[PDB]
Subunit: 321 residues, 4 copies
């Protein structure tokens, strides 16, 4: 998985979901008066409305990622083995399951400071949604129109990082990803001067030589470096449309095509879908592996207590002339 | 620029056009009885029909790339400094300008073997279309449903290479590009064994580790290696639609986004358009930097002697629910 | 800097000293009855004798690295910005200066377990030797014949890591250096199979294709990966002499030649000396930038004994 | 294998010999009146003297590398599959075995231009020294005190390149090795500025970040790049002694240690010896995998003079 923010004409948050299979993902709107039940905390009958991508099970929205009516976003990304969910409750903490964590923050917080304040009081508990849907190790990107934080809950506790670049992938831990960038300082968007030696006339027979050393593989570290280089150098858009266009191109640079990454099951890991939330206009834009055409759904914060779902089109929608 | 072939349910040929501006590209269908005039050879009044992408100037189709009604494809890709157009006519060769070369081959040839016959007899001449459209250095991929060749006309002569992988980018010369793959033999689609040393317990905390080493930059050699890796390991599809989808994902792994590749003059190189020709069904599929949605145009049976054009639309066509 | 251990026919510990100038490095034997004086701790009149490399200022042995009579070895390597030296004394700790740290451990400790329990009680304090020899930030490799530890005193406190590979360079911190090896698991001593794709006939026109991916530069992370690869795959020696020879070849893989690493000052960082200590036979073997010939000095009570380095190339001229 | 040149106070030429065993290498002086016998050409009774490294077999000097009394150098380096030895004689050429090739050039040529002219007239014939010592594909660096050329005899003919950097390893062919440097133009001897982006605070916690991207393996292309970088950036010496010290440091950056490069047979490739020839003083310095101390022999009969290489660590005990 790769999650990014982008600051342009509007402000953006979105992700690639990289898995061996789809899980029946769909757009889920959770309205202000859908009652959020928690395993070890008091129900919330009144909260911020959410739009996100996930699955519904037992009438519960299980989000991969979502935003709320205030343009606060959150995404869960794979964090295998490093994630630690506590088998003990905590007296003066909010005891919340991984699968409740997005509803817990996005339901109640308007921005990243409020989100940080609530995470500081959290105890993530090792309770599965069900026997059929056991817990996976995750970390989180929480983003508003201004800034983002990374939440990693490991054996050493609840770790909250200011994300200075608005980039997250998978393992290793965030300080390791940020440190790993340092060895790529010499990369450039333009042709380098010959610093190798002026005793040999080295020639340039094409463009893009300043990039030489950027990794091209789909390991999480390589995707972290590549997404950061692509995002931080990406040209500004004149319009929101150009920003959304640029957002999909950036996610495109770290996309996993079917065949290059074969899991232990023999199944290829691929980018199941890509999305771009316009935080200011509370609009979800998404593409899927099977369909290039961008789909848009807007969150109207109106009321209701029923989850509203829109299934994914998993056919290539071609303009035939 | 990147050009590729793919063998699936049908058989495909197509390219990324990488440039810092748009020429106002369009689909151009040249019918059978559109008369091809040549600066230094006899006119061809009856020939194979073409569908491709480029511009029309003085009612002449200037193809960037095209196919004919037999499923033979030809693409011109940037080859600066290495391309050599002759200041001499040769009495025992066909004297053909670079801009006539696609009409010359696709108008007259049904397969790669016949294209090879005409290229063996060709002398590309240093004669420009017009003042506003000067000659720039090109090399070509010629492809049918079975195979492909690379034509490089340099100071040392007319070079034809069998293309064992169906991949072409820019400089360097094809023998150099193919030799440069040899160093990447150790790359893998799967998590490799620890061959570093069994004296240290090296851990794997994510998928995609076997690709570590694959270059990620947009230099022509890095794109050559990355296109080759992505294409040769691409998963098979069970439909033509899945092949077309997969084709655009492969071209996406080597696409240039606005801002990562900046020239001396400060121009931002980007992937202006991506296309996929179905050679068996004679159908062009394309996308633009500005529009993710695939557009399709079939070459139908004649009749006509007039060029038929479909201008590229450069606006994001979003599906709004 | 690069420090390594090697377990062969004997057991070995040694290092490259990488700097932009020579301090006049020499062999220094601190005999058992040389009195070690500390700025904030009681003196040690009777201790383990030490043999090492460094300089003498004010009749004090300023060791770069050394071993004691028990074959316990300690080397200080550059650790800029991460090293923390305390401006406070501590009642419940030993208050030792960085330049005192090698004498404090090696003078009193015969093995790594004893070194570790003594380091667990240390408070490294922010006191320079002189105006003309101020504190540079360091981390330490401590090695006996069985195993080795890394000591990093930083702002988060006194970190002691088991060293499963017997390798140390400079920044970053040890957990970072070790994690950084994971991405090189694919490297090999043998010609790999074509795993890129069986649909293209990739040719091998030379030996050594399995190491493609190994970093060649003199950055501290690159030297860590390359020393690890070269050390773990180095052929066994049949003798002690062959183990020594292999040791100098291993340090040779990550040596800095003059010209390839130009500092902020504009001076060339270079391997001033390479050494190999035989822990079991208490012997110091060393080479210098200027002199390829290996020099050997054995440890076997009052005054420092010194042997200056030759900075001339000692060439066996036949006729 | 890696061969280099170096121009400083004097002028130098030398190489690592990378192999998975030792032939029993030795210093060989061939005096001016040792008779050079050839399989298909007239013998030479009187010629320029040579000092170099090789083996003697059938009382013949089989040079791995050598220089002559004019400080013209020539080394043979592994060039497997690419080397083309002709099966036919050619009357308008000199018909010369690869193993005769060094004696042939260094015997008669004073400088690089004269070696060029003689090489131009050459046909390298496919005759083995003996059944015990069969042909192996080789290419050649020929250096004097001013410049070097590369001789690669392939299926497309006798190729001579000006070597602008004074570097040679193995495969690939020279134009490919030279083109391959272009992608390293961004490498530096000093810490680079952050060109990655002005929007992230990338930190430098050590020296040598400029070299990141330099290949560290012992493949022939990686050694070509690393030997080029090391050599072209190496600091100037103030004396001949400092130059020779620098030469071996340079050969050191690309040497092969036992265990990192295992061949087809499971044999360990390693740098059997390293040598620096001072061309102006006609002196051979050499080291061995087993002996770090430098050994030296100057080029001052009709019999070969030989000095067996020592494969023992000559240690200065204090
Ligand atoms: C400029 C194009 C090549 C792209 C390029 O220059 N690359 C930039 C650097 S990189 O990619 O990022 O490496 C080439 C490809 C096809 C060319 C066009 C076609 O060949 C058709 C005609 C041919 C005429 O001779 C000239 C005008 C022209 C209309 C050409 C103009 C231009 O040279 C084009 C559009
Ligand atoms: C099986 C998936 C993880 C596979 C994995 O281990 N990834 C390795 C990638 S890498 O090494 O980091 O490269 C996880 C990741 C996200 C998970 C889903 C999401 O977290 C959302 C809900 C959460 C509910 O608790 C369970 C159902 C579920 C719909 C989850 C099912 C499943 O456990 C998923 C799909
Ligand atoms: C084996 C040596 C080259 C090293 C090598 O094989 N390394 C492999 C590097 S790579 O795969 O190309 O990457 C070569 C270099 C010089 C050669 C020798 C000299 O040229 C002298 C004679 C010449 C005779 O023709 C054959 C025997 C011989 C005694 C040669 C034996 C062998 O072919 C040597 C020693
Ligand atoms: C300067 C040396 C290390 C620095 C270096 O150049 N490393 C390069 C690697 S990088 O930058 O981290 O990348 C260190 C190693 C051991 C140190 C010396 C020894 O500890 C002995 C004394 C101790 C005194 O406190 C200071 C003077 C001194 C004589 C020290 C001077 C300097 O601090 C030395 C010589």
């Amino acid at each position: 998985c790769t999650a990014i923010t982008l600051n342009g004409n509007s402000n953006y948050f979105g992700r690639n979901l990289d898995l061996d299979f789809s899980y029946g993902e769909e757009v889920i709107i959770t309205p202000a008066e859908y009652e959020f039940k928690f395993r070890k905390e008091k129900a919330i009958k009144n909260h911020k409305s959410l739009i996100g991508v996930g699955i519904v099970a037992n009438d519960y929205p299980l989000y991969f990622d979502a935003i709320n009516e205030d343009g606060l976003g959150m995404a869960g990304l794979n964090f295998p083995g490093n994630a630690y969910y506590s088998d003990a409750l905590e007296n003066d903490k909010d005891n919340i399951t991984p699968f409740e964590f997005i509803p817990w923050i996005l339901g109640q917080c308007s921005d990243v400071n409020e989100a940080r304040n609530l995470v500081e009081k959290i105890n993530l508990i090792n309770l599965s949604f069900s026997e059929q849907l056991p817990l996976a190790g995750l970390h989180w990107l929480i983003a508003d129109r201004e800034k983002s934080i990374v939440v990693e809950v490991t054996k050493s506790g609840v770790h909250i990082y200011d994300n200075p670049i608005g980039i997250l992938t998978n393992n290793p831990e965030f300080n390791y990803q940020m440190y790993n960038l340092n060895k790529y300082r010499n990369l450039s968007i333009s042709t380098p001067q010959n610093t190798f030696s002026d005793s040999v006339d080295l020639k340039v027979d094409g463009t893009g030589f300043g990039g030489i050393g950027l990794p091209g593989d789909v390991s999480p570290e390589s995707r972290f470096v590549r997404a950061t280089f692509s995002k931080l150098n990406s040209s500004k858009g004149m319009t929101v449309e150009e920003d959304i266009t640029q957002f999909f191109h950036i996610l495109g640079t770290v996309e996993q095509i079917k065949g290059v990454n074969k899991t232990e099951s023999g199944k290829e890991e691929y980018t199941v879908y890509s999305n771009c939330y316009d935080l200011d206009n509370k609009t979800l834009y998404y593409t899927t592996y099977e369909n290039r055409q961008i789909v848009a759904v807007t969150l109207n914060k109106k009321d209701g207590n029923r989850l509203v779902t829109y299934p994914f089109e998993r056919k290539q929608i071609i303009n035939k002339l």
